[PDB]
Amino acid sequence: GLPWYRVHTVLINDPGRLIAAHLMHTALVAGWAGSMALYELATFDPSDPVLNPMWRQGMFVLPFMARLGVTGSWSGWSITGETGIDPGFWSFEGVALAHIVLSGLLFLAACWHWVYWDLELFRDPRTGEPALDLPKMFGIHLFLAGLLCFGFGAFHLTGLFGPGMWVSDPYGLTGSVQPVAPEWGPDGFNPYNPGGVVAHHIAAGIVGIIAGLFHILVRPPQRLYKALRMGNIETVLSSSIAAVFFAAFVVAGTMWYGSATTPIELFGPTRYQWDSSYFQQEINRRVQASLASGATLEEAWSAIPEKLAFYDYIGNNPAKGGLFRTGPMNKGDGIAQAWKGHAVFRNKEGEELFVRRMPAFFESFPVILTDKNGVVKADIPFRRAESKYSFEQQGVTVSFYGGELNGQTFTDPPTVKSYARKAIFGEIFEFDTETLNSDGIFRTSPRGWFTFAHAVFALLFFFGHIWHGARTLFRDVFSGIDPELSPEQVEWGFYQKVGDVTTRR
Amino acid sequence: MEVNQLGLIATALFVLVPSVFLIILYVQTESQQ
């Protein structure tokens, strides 16, 4: 009979039941989106968008709803921390419902098309065989994608008729959903310019409309029809898989690097913000400024928002996780409660010292304090017997400015050491480790999981492209090579051109 | 709620083992005729 791995090939010459299978897959996906969103609503804590935002709680689909404008719940909260909101029907709950209902409708349509599989529409009037005019279908479907793509850009994103999209400042502090005007200039191609996203969909939409017009009206050339087996639906699978893995690699890329469509308030920060001290620089700008207008140290550090301090913390770096460290980030380091404040270390001579920060590559890292110039001046030693830079010897202290500990200073070495061990991770926070029985080990964020999954699926789908590409072009020998094939064909010199019997001698 | 952890595995198997038994016997019944 059919091998287990060929079961679904009974659909290849059965357009109706192909549609039925495609409907059922569609229903499954929609059902999943619906189900996933209900699970996230049941587990999300909305009470703190500063220190407990969605991307700390393992939320995967909640950020895609937020991205395009869904921001509030029928229970009266929004993700921007505003209470007493009325979102109407298109809350997180109503989006989830609409996907369940949709799933159920598609389930039903799949049953009808499975049973009434023999519709005359699918039978070539000429020969009576099941036939699908794939060139013409592509024109139709392309025209339709063009229109959706144009309309999505022209109305949803611009806000002419719709909500816009998530936009924020460069440091992820003030994000919200805002209409976006298209950027027609060359800065439209800057992945960090959201106006480029609007422009893209308008211009590409139109181009898709016109390309689809061409593909409805003008037949493919015989040369291209033969070369690409355009009467065989497996050719479309082969080229469709190719475009999917291309698409999946780009979306893994923009998720890992940052684009205007992968904002840090919805997905968390990138690893490259930690590498480049992107948040630490900005924090230091604001402090230096404050001290330039006569504020005290306590005042200038007290003026840094917790949200910005929290970005400058390696526990939020997506490249700090592990593959089987499962669940939300809050199950690792715990639920962030408060900024403890900026820790300033000084040795016995008053000179201020700086903990060397943990690079992402390192599961563990030693505690080394340097001076403004990078000279090592203090460290926690391993071998104690010949140690010359110990906190005890060098008399280092820690004083806190801002946050929970503003104005406090510690001088006992064991306590200075524990704050120095945390300073390797950046700014120091108070964590609730009890609620979730957190184990203290870093996990990755939704930016991490997304990228991993899509990179992996993209790579696997390349194999699918090679597999279906070959089966299209070699279909004649799928079951095997021709039994009555001779050495004059495959041996050397008999023919001047390989394969061409007409080139004798 | 503070609920018996093994309840889940118990329920899944309680469902899965007898159901798979029935399916096995049905499908090989249809392959006969």
């Binding site: 699970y39 049941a42 049953c111 | 709620m1 609920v3 309840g7 889940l8 329920t11 469902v15």
Partner: peptide, 30 residues
Amino acid sequence: METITYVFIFACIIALFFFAIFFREPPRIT
């Protein structure tokens, strides 16, 4: 988890209903 389990089983029963009605062995006479 217990909520998901309860609703899951209930959902299976409803699906079974569907097949039992519309995909039954059709009774045939004599």
